[PDB]
Design a binder for these strands. Structure first.
Lengths: 48, 134, 111, 133, 167, 219, 206, 49
RNA sequence: CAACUAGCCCCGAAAAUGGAUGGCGCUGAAGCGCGCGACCCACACCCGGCCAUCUGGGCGAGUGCCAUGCCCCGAUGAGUA
RNA sequence: AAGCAGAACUGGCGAUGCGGGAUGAACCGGAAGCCGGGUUACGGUGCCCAACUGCGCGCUAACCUAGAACCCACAAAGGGU
RNA sequence: GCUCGGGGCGUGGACUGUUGUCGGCCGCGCCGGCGGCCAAAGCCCGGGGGCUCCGCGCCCCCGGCAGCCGUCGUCGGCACGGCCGGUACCCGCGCGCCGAAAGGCGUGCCCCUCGGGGCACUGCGCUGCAACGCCCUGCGGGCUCCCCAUCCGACCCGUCU
């Protein structure tokens, strides 16, 4: 199911509704970038 | 003037934004010149920051120990004043709400009619003054 | 006459065309920004989507034997906190109209 | 099919009009587009307002290419023989009388064209050549 | 508070290492965070700096929230606080009057922001320990409520009300 | 979502019923379907193209559906309406019936207020809280076919004849409509006078003052 | 909350009495662009928050910059409170385009009162220096205290200002008394006409 | 997914109540993770190694 | 009462064509630090329409013929030397 | 010391507009077909100038330079009951 | 039997502009449910403790309870609009009946066993609907200059660099 990965090849996501958190910082400092399980799904549900 | 500030329980307040959008509250406990713990009888308490909420003239007499239920008892004792407050006596907002809900066919028809009756009164009064003048 | 009733010459609630949709740098004339009079908030201006707009103007020349001409449009969606709205017109409004009043009708009513 | 494609071409217009830079202040410098070769041109660098450059994307729909706004395909018709080819099309193609052709020979083209039912612009060109405004 | 303010998170963990009879336990400094996003990084960092474990050998069991402690009313959070200015970290002990944990964070954050010039790279606190109204010792904010809670002095300076205007 | 759910989690439950009813006859349009119809002897060119037939049938049904429900917000026959667009806009009028076209028959009584019978669109209208009782009014005479405005074919007469220019292109008052309108209006007046001061109110007109909000105003 | 003052269908007259100079200038300028016809009255009586020293020195350095290396032809400083106010609006509004020139021409400055505008000018939603202040909030300095130190137009103005105020004050009070009196007998005369039903719904619609 | 949380609801009882008024934690039991990831590119290809 | 810590403000801080937080002006800021929402907003991003280019198809069995044609794809396209 | 001379790595400019930094070849955001509609970035929301004179909590009173956005248009030791 | 014209009847076609609608895409505001976070703020009832030791009062904890809460996740429902297109081969759909209309009308099966539901069962033919103006009287329009609005305007291009 790493061959049930074997994707389309890009999901072409929309730019997020309500915008991003700042690009210049990582997740800890109130930026967007890097790991976060809870808030990635929130972001992807703005990028419908 | 950074509203009414003090040290004492019982001073009623009136909305200048919150949530709630109606609501009148009393200050049960006191916590600097900005924050106040506000509650109302059958309504959920909040301790909230209010640089921009101002307190009204009327005070109700209540003491320390504030449950939810204690507040209700005081309101029953008072009551009466609240009705007057809406129209005139500090608040004025609650009577203003009534104006908006009064543009609704039957209500609007009646509303216009009031003004027409008033028109007649102005003419009648004016005659009395006019005769005296000339 | 027919279509006539018993008073109000002003049929509409008032509005104003401030400008066009804009950066500091550039304008896009395709969408116009109108601040609608008496509209204080974002919630209130949400009502105005779908309504018809008329810019009525007078001109020196006659046309089909009338000096009065009009450009029609429609309200697309709200813009900003202050009760500004976005609008498109069939042909763009003349940008000399910055600072003019324009008319926003009740005409197709959602309510 | 054909009808909404016509509407898209005519109403939208990329009649941008590709003017050469500084054509306005040098009379001899031609209106006709030629590509700014030098780096130093603003037009080359693709600054907006400096007159946008011709590119393929400006191009119209394939069907609506070389069509008269009537949705007819324009054909300049030299003589009577060429009208027979146009007859096959009828609606699709148009007849327009050539510049070279003189007034008497225009008349025979018009009367034949009428039989094909490709009356549009053919008649109009002839009528002026007679005497008419 | 509504749309948070920075809830203090009771962060649950381990210290995951080796199939040996030993194991470190989790240790906590109770940290204000935004939700999970802010919480995870500092949780590793407290362990890493002090004792060292790693980040991958730091395991997060759960994150648990907070529910109303102080019943809206006031109790006197004793905070020892560290602000980074011109060098390393400097001592402060501010014991203050506050609503609850949301608000407690706000009051310290503003004091640091103004006085010590402070943003996220400054650390939080050392410990939080409530104390009773008469007992609490330092000054300014606490005194006004303290005098009210045991009364007689509820009934002092009641005169500003109606006299804010004029009367 | 909620109306469409039966069809969505069925797929073609309504259309299944029709086939099985046809099959209740016995053995039928499986056999007939192959045999059925015309073809083979063309016109002009390939004949690649279009309509009559099949296509018309779902489209007519779908266009009918907006007339209540979607446009309507809710409105029962005899609701008082505000016409916000149309010619007669700003007049409050009483709702007679909804047509097959989807346009509404209205009529304010002609003498008091100028509104004739007329067709107006549902989309324009604000539904007010008032209802006037249309219990015993004969709205029946006025129908969808009643409202055909004659075109400029020729003279209004039988046809085939050389005609004169004195046609009404964008207008036409039939004489019959004027006679009929008086009768229907008479019943309405009785209902209108029953509630006081409604009669004057309809003609006066509603419009929004400066400072008035159309959002807050909602009847 | 909702702004009761600003753009109006027709009703733009603006009070400058104890307003904030730049706060008023900013909002007025926006209205002028919007095509409104703004008449600012009581222009000299507008206030600028801050100590006299720092308000004064701002104009003083501008005077030095006007003063020297001389043609004429541009560098200028206005001596008058009305023309300082005009200059402020001519910094708000694009002063390099015909539309902004037209907007500038819809501004009027009247000192004291124009020839009788018997409708009062009414305060702009909290624009004022007085209220926006707890009382104090340190000092303020009037335009009329600045402009006396810069030269003529104020010097002639100040004597004249007093005269207009005295005359209009007297008349305004006496009409108020009679106007008020009408209302007192109005309630009696709403009872008197048999009674009323509809009109006693009216104080429930305050 | 829900029954994983339900399992630790049943087993654990030492985590929730007292621990807000204290630091550290005790024993009991631990919930595993096992998660694939989704990666969306926030920042462009400009100016990076 | 004393010694400190560090914020802003003041001093230290004086140049010539007059002058520049870009300007006006701003003092419970429109300042300064910071938080929270809402909102504004590039030829960017998405969806749709459309152009060419490239890629993959497809359709000639002749007797309408461009078969280097026509038609369906989807992605891509700044551009000096 | 230098907007200096010379290397190491990388990205740009050169071959780069557009949006942002008032303004700026190189900084920031992003590489750009042609359009409609949506949605953002950078940066903003008193007015200029599109956009909250929005909410919240502090600090600041500057007659010897109040203060006001990386690069960047300078600035320090040291002093203040 | 056909065609030109006339007679006689029915349907209504002429650039271009406008309005209604169905579908697709996208935004828009608002309303509702459940679970997570042992659930608990909460209130009444009950019990004990501390602090205060001047007592009110304050706090803390535990057991029964209308209750309603901030945050996480998910589903559910409405009300409107922009834009594009009218779906030209399997997108959609009709072909017996009634019903202006929309819409419904078979039967078996099973769950519910109530209200209703889900689930099974024939082949062909085929993709744009409502309205207004006028086409000629007369006029929409296109194009150029100008004025007003708006804007990159690094001076115009080339070259060197």
């Amino acid at each position: 199911f790493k061959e049930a990965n074997n994707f389309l090849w890009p999901f072409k996501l929309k730019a997020p509704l309500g915008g991003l958190k700042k690009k210049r910082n990582h997740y800890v400092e109130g930026g967007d970038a890097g790991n976060r399980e809870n808030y990635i799904n929130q972001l992807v549900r703005r990028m419908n | 003037m950074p509203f009414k500030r003090f040290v004492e329980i019982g001073r009623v307040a009136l909305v200048n934004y919150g949530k709630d959008y109606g609501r009148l509250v009393v200050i049960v406990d006191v916590v600097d010149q900005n924050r106040a713990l506000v509650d109302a009888p059958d309504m959920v308490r909040c301790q909230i920051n209010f640089k921009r909420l101002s307190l009204t003239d009327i005070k109700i007499d209540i003491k320390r120990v504030p449950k939810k239920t204690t507040l209700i008892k005081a309101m029953e004792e008072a009551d009466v004043k609240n009705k007057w407050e809406n129209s005139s006596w500090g608040k004025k907002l609650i009577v203003q709400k009534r104006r908006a809900s009064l543009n609704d066919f039957d209500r609007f028809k009646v509303m216009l009619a009031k003004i027409k009756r008033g028109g007649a009164i102005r003419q009648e009064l004016a005659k009395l003054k006019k005769t005296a003048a000339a | 006459m027919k279509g006539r009733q018993g008073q109000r010459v002003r049929l509409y609630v008032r509005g104003t065309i401030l400008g066009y949709k804009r950066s500091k740098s550039n304008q896009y004339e395709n969408t116009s920004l109108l601040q609608i009079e008496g509209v204080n908030t974002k919630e209130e201006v949400g009502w105005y989507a779908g309504k018809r707009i008329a810019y009525v103007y007078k001109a020196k020349t006659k046309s089909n034997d009338s000096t009065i001409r009009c450009i029609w449009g429609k309200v697309t969606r709200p813009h900003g906190n202050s009760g500004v709205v976005r609008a498109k017109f069939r042909s763009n409004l003349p940008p000399t109209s910055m600072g003019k009043k324009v008319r926003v009708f009740m005409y197709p009513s959602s309510i | 099919m054909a009808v909404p494609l016509l509407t898209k071409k005519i109403v939208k217009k990329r009649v941008k009009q590709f003017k050469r830079p500084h054509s306005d202040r040098y009379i001899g410098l031609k209106t006709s587009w030629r590509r700014p070769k030098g780096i130093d041109s603003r037009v080359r660098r693709k600054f907006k307002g400096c007159t946008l450059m011709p590119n393929i994307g400006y191009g119209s729909d394939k069907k609506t290419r070389h069509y008269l706004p009537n949705k007819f395909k324009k054909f300049v018709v030299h003589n009577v023989s060429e009208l027979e080819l146009l007859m096959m099309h009828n609606r699709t193609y148009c007849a327009e009388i050539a510049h070279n052709v003189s007034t008497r020979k225009r008349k025979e083209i018009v009367e034949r064209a009428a039989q094909l039912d490709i009356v549009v612009t053919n008649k109009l060109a002839r009528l002026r050549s007679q005497e008419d405004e | 508070m509504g749309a948070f303010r920075f809830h203090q998170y009771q962060v649950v963990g381990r210290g995951l290492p080796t199939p040996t009879d030993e194991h470190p336990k989790i240790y906590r400094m109770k940290l204000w965070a935004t939700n999970e996003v802010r919480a995870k990084s500092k949780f590793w960092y407290f362990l890493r700096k002090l004792k060292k474990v790693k980040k991958s050998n730091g395991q997060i069991l759960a994150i648990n929230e907070i529910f109303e402690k102080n019943p809206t009313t006031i109790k006197n959070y004793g905070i020892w606080l560290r602000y980074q200015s011109r060098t390393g970290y400097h001592n402060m002990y501010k014991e203050y009057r506050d609503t609850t944990l949301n608000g407690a964070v706000e009051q310290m954050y503003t004091e640091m922001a103004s006085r010590h010039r402070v943003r996220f790279p400054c650390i939080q606190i050392i410990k939080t320990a409530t104390v009773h109204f008469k007992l609490c010792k330092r000054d300014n904010t606490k005194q006004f409520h303290k005098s009210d809670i045991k009364f007689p002095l509820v009934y002092r300076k009641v005169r500003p009300p109606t006299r804010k205007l004029k009367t | 979502m909620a109306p469409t759910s039966k069809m969505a989690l069925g797929i073609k439950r309504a259309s299944r019923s029709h086939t099985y009813h046809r099959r209740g006859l016995w053995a039928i349009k499986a056999k007939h379907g192959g045999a059925l119809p015309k073809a083979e002897k063309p016109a002009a060119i390939a004949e690649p193209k279009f309509y009559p037939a099949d296509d018309v049938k779902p489209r007519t049904v779908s266009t009918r559906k907006p007339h209540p429900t979607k446009l309507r917000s809710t409105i029962t026959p005899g609701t008082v309406l505000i016409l916000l667009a149309g010619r007669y806009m700003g007049k409050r009028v009483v709702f007679l019936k909804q047509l097959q076209s989807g346009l509404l028959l209205i009529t304010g009584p002609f003498k008091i207020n100028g509104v004739p019978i007329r067709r107006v669109n549902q989309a324009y209208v604000i539904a007010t809280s008032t209802k006037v009782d249309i219990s015993k009014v004969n709205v029946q005479k006025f129908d969808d076919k009643y409202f055909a405005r004659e075109k400029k074919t020729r003279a209004k007469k039988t046809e085939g004849e050389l005609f004169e220019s004195d046609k009404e292109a964008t207008k036409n008052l039939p004489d019959f409509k004027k006679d009929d309108q008086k009768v229907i209006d008479a019943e309405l007046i009785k209902a209108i006078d029953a509630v006081p001061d409604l009669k004057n109110y309809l003609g006066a007109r509603f419009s929004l003052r400066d400072g008035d909000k159309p959002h807050e105003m909602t009847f | 909350m909702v702004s009761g003052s600003g753009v109006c269908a027709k009703r733009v007259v603006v009070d400058a009495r104890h307003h904030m100079l730049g706060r008023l200038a900013s909002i007025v300028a926006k209205e002028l662009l919007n095509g409104q016809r703004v008449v600012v009255v009581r222009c000299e009586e507008i206030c600028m928050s801050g100590g006299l020293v720092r308000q004064k020195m701002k104009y003083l350095r501008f005077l030095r910059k006007r003063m020297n290396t001389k043609p004429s032809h541009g560098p200028i400083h206005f001596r008058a409170p009305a023309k300082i106010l005009w200059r402020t609006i001519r910094g708000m509004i694009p002063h390099k385009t015909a539309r902004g020139e037209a907007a500038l021409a819809r501004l009027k400055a009247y000192e004291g009162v124009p020839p009788p505008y018997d409708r009062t000018k009414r305060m702009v939603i909290p624009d004022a220096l007085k209220v926006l202040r707890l009382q104090p909030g340190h000092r303020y300095c009037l335009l009329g205290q600045l402009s006396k130190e810069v030269g003529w137009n104020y010097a002639d103005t100040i004597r004249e200002l007093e005269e207009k105020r005295k005359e209009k004050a007297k008349v305004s009070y006496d009409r108020r008394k009679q106007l008020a009196k009408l209302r007192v007998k109005a309630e009696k005369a709403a009872e008197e006409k048999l009674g009323t039903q509809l009109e006693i719904l009216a104080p429930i619609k305050y | 997914a829900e029954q994983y949380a339900g399992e630790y609801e049943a087993q654990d009882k030492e985590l929730v109540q007292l621990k807000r008024e204290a630091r550290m934690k005790g024993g009991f039991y631990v919930s595993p993770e096992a998660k694939p990831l989704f990666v969306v590119r926030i920042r462009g290809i400009n100016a990076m190694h």
